[PDB]
Nucleic acid binder design. Structure first.
Lengths: 50, 214, 131, 102, 128, 115, 148
RNA sequence: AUGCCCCGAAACCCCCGGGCUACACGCGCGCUACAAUGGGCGGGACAAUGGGACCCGACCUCGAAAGGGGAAGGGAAUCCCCUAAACCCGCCCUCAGUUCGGAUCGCGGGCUGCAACUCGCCCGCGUGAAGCUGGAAUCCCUAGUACCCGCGUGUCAUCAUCGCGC
């Protein structure tokens, strides 16, 4: 009864792996991170501003 | 497509658009001579960066500039007699091919209605539709006052062509009548200094008021 | 014939036949086109030549469109509630059908019933600033 | 005849050029015809994100781009040549895929 | 002779040889292309070159990319360059320059990117 | 009498589920074809028992997507509108319409003095 | 001479008037009542529009070689207005072009390469280039420059 | 990350019905409708950013159709999304709240998901709102730029008329 139902679709299925929010999860080739968390890991991922 | 191919092959001997070479056409008033580009060119379209040139617009052909005015005339702050002018349905904006075809029909109409070189009649209309004095506000000791001021020739061209285009929009809007026939009327009425034409009438309005504000 | 009556309503002869039937509440553009093609006549001809035999041909296509080669999806109310047969309602027939549906929805107390009662939208339209 | 198609991919251009030079030197020292390194279309992964951490503020956005570059080396088949591409010192970011084509 | 032409995105590749005067755009005759204005633009350099060289050489041009206007302008560039390279004549080049400065130069203009804040309507478009 | 697509209410009772679905519009028939949930199925078991009298309980439900069939004609079911189980009695004209359209969840919105 | 040396409009008109005679190509009984495309707003006006479709579709098989139904739908698609929402580009109908392709396939003019598309038989090429060289003769007379 | 305070079967957690979409209304921003440039049939010059594995899905075949059965190739200059759109013409319609325009209803089909009436869209059918150029006043761009026209994709089964960027 204390289990969360199994969802493959919708926001409740997708969660950011770092922060844990249920909101903005960019999935370009499988990142699983929130949109703002993406900035605190930008330069470790190899990304560079141009 | 035979009319199309005929108009394709006729200007093989360098004729503006299709016909009516620029040699027979002259200029009457001495001021427009170094600013109207009457050089013989097959198409009135250069895609040129004459805006970047402080005065390089003088090198653009007159019909090209006329289309340049015609294609940007819809939707603005002017309500002449309380009307809103705008190209809601297939706007000429960015559709210079539509403008090309429409002013092509305009040349045809002026041919079949006057029987002369269209460029000559266009010269007549622009020469007779140019206002020659205007009003300017000058303040001294906080004392704003109006002043009669002479106009530069290039601005006279700009305003004349703008009257032509704005007249075409004005008559063609909200009528069963079609754009080309209207442009033909504005040109022919200005070329004979017909005051019913908006171009000549507003040339007269701008010349007046400035006439009295001395 | 400048004035032509078909199926209890009047049409003008100037407009073409597909456009002429458009004045029938119970015939549209596509419907007029396909019935006049079922008739074998171009819908483009002017409605001033509508002869009586062709008029009753159009009438009996309105009466029983499905038997005239028309498919069942081109009618306004396919699979009618009280019969289960696809038919095309004309004039007061449409009006009574929609009246019956309104009363039926009110009777069952559906959401659409109360929306129709209040003159309110049905399909999830938002009333905060529009309307 | 048989050819080996070697696809090298990396982010830093210098590592890819290093491995290309090593492969070219090895192919020439082994005396094997090698089709030179063909630089394939670099893939540009572009991501846009609003810089505002909250719903308050002017809408400012930032675009970041990965330029992942790739090269193709078509060499002729030679076992002595194929024994000297598994011993090469490969930088970590460089990925190499070596397939065979009739 | 092989010649190149670039306008915005369209690219014109032209091959000029001796022949009856058969000029073909992507394999199609120049006289049948439905846009008449594009036909004018394509025909301008060989209008100005002369009937003699028009009939003397054969030019096959393939145009790819851009729009029809870009294709036509790139084709115009390609015919101009092909004619001047085939003849190697200075007077034709100077007449071409006098007609317009791009016939051997071209347009170095390219499109700008769409900046943020309602990027949809163009680069320099912002909200109200 | 009452009819639905040319069949009287008895003619609706005797027909099987396949054709009973055939006489429904696209949405309700497609929902039937794609199956029912097990809460829905057990609620159908309970209402079958109540129709046969074994289930004496006042019947309550929360499934707002339950398409009412002819077999539900003639019983009072209480659907959860948002606070409690508001009651509704199923009529012969009720066939072919979801239960959820019959529990008023959103309330009447009238206008007071503007501020 | 070939289709490539002649305008598309005139050539499709010639193929349409020529194929109107052939009995294997015919508009089905549901053709006069169903518009040529989903995106279309009104019904077709002329009653020859079916044969034109055929006259065009075979020309497509003359140019692209293998053709299927979905790509034909995307090509024949167009812009439809969505009321308050903006105009959108939509695909055309599929059954009409599928029937036209089947009628042509029974006509022997086109054939099916399963798993690659519909290609054009040599006989279809002969008929198309015969019409095209007919038109090229006519336009050579009208326009001598086409001799080049 | 966290100063401080507060609840501890709760100020905890889980499950579900509804709400977050509710209206006499005020305001902002985008989308479209306010035609003869025009709506409809047919031909043709055309890209491009990127994406695709329960996916791109070409393609055979059936069904109007949304789609179903089979199916090649593809984990990226290899296959697909693939068509751009703007445009012109051979032809039709003839200045009208209409052949504009589709909101608004009801019908019957399609996709998704446990399920969409609160709470998706589309496919076709009778139906056709207001709108036919809008005051004081009013915001912003200035050369591949304004104007104007569309493609694609992010997030994502669907939802955005949005943002992005081509």
């Amino acid at each position: 009864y204390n289990k969360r139902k199994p969802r493959k679709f919708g926001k409740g299925a997708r969660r950011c792996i770092r922060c844990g929010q249920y909101g903005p999860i960019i999935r370009i080739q499988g990142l699983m991170l929130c949109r703002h968390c993406f900035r605190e890991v930008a330069p470790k991922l190899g990304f560079r501003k141009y | 497509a035979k009319p199309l191919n005929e108009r394709f092959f006729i200007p093989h001997e360098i004729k503006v658009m299709g016909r009516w070479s620029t040699e027979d056409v002259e200029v009457r008033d001495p001021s427009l001579k170094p600013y109207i580009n009457l050089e013989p060119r097959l198409l009135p379209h250069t895609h040129g960066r004459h805006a970047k040139k402080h005065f390089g617009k003088a090198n653009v052909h007159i019909v090209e500039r006329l289309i340049n005015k015609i294609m940007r005339s819809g939707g603005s702050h002017y309500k002449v007699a309380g009307h809103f002018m705008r190209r809601e349905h297939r706007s000429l904006n960015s559709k210079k091919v539509k403008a090309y075809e429409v002013v092509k029909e305009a040349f045809k109409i002026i041919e079949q209605r006057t029987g002369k070189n269209p460029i000559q009649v266009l010269v007549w209309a622009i020469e007779n539709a140019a206002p020659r004095e205007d009003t300017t506000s000058v303040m001294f000791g906080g004392i704003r006052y109006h002043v009669a001021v002479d106009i530069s020739p290039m601005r006279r061209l700009d305003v004349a062509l703008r009257n032509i285009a704005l007249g075409a929009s004005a008559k063609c809007y909200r009528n069963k009548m079609s754009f080309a026939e209207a442009l033909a009327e504005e040109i022919i009425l200005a070329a004979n200094k017909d005051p019913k034409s908006y171009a000549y009438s507003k040339k007269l309005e701008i010349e007046r008021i400035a006439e009295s504000s001395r | 014939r400048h004035i032509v009556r078909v199926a209890g309503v009047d049409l003008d002869g100037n407009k073409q036949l597909r456009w002429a039937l458009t004045a029938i509440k119970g015939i549209g553009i596509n419907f007029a086109t396909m019935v006049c093609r079922v008739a074998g006549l171009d819908p483009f001809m002017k409605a001033g030549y509508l002869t009586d035999e062709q008029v009753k041909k159009i009438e009996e296509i309105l009466a029983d469109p499905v038997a005239h080669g028309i498919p069942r999806w081109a009618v306004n109310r396919p699979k009618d509630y009280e019969t289960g047969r696809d038919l095309h309602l004309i004039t007061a027939k449409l009006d009574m059908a929609i009246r019956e549906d309104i009363m039926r929805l009110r009777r069952i107390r559906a959401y659409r019933g109360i929306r129709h009662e209040l003159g309110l939208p049905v399909r999830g339209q938002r009333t905060r600033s529009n309307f | 005849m048989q050819k080996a198609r070697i696809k090298i991919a990396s982010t830093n251009v210098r590592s890819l050029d290093e491995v290309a030079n090593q492969i070219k030197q090895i192919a020439e020292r082994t005396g094997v015809r090698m089709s030179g390194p063909i630089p394939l279309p670099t893939k540009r992964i572009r991501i846009t994100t609003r810089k505002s951490p909250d719903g308050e503020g002017s809408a400012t956005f930032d675009r970041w781009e990965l330029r992942v570059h790739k090269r193709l080396i078509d060499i002729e088949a030679d076992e002595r040549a194929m024994r000297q591409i598994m011993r090469i010192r490969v930088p970590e970011d460089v990925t190499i895929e070596i397939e065979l084509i009739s | 002779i092989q010649t190149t032409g670039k306008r915005k995105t369209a690219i014109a590749r032209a091959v000029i040889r001796e022949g009856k005067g058969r000029v073909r755009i992507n394999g199609k005759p120049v006289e049948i292309i439905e846009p008449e204005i594009a036909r004018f633009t394509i025909l301008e350099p060989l209008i100005l070159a002369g009937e003699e060289i028009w009939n003397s050489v054969d030019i096959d041009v393939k145009v790819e990319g851009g729009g029809f206007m870009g294709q036509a302008e790139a084709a115009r560039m390609a015919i101009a360059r092909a004619l001047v390279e085939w003849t190697g004549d200075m007077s034709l080049k100077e007449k071409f320059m006098k007609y317009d400065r791009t016939m051997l130069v071209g347009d170095p203009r390219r499109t700008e990117p769409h900046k943020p804040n309602r990027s949809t309507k163009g680069p320099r478009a912002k909200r109200q | 009498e009452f009819r639905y697509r040319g069949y009287t209410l008895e003619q609706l009772m005797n027909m099987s589920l396949e054709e009973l679905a055939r006489l429904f519009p696209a949405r309700q028939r497609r929902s039937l074809k794609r199956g029912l949930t097990p809460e829905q199925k057990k609620l159908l078991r309970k209402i079958r028992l109540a129709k046969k009298g074994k289930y004496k309980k006042p019947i309550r439900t929360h499934c707002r997507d339950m398409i009412i069939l002819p077999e539900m004609v003639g019983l009072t079911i209480y659907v959860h509108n948002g606070k409690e189980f508001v009651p509704v009695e199923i009529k012969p004209e009720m066939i072919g319409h979801y239960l959820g359209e019959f529990a008023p969840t959103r309330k009447k919105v009238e206008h007071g003095a503007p501020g | 001479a070939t289709v490539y040396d002649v305008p598309g409009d005139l050539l499709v008109e010639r193929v349409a008037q020529r194929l109107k005679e052939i009995p294997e190509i015919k508009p089905p009984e549901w053709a006069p009542f169903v518009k040529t495309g989903r995106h279309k707003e009104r019904l077709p006006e002329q009653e020859d529009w079916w044969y034109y479709r055929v006259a065009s579709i075979l020309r497509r098989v003359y140019l692209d070689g293998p053709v299927g139904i979905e790509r034909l739908r995307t090509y024949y698609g167009g812009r439809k207005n969505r009321g308050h929402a903006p105009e959108k580009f939509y695909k055309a109908g599929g059954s009409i072009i599928r029937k036209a392709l089947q009628q042509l396939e029974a006509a022997g003019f086109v054939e099916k390469v399963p798993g690659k598309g519909r290609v054009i038989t040599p006989k279809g090429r002969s008929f198309l280039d015969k019409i095209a060289t007919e038109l090229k003769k006519e336009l050579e007379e009208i326009i001598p420059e086409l001799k080049k």
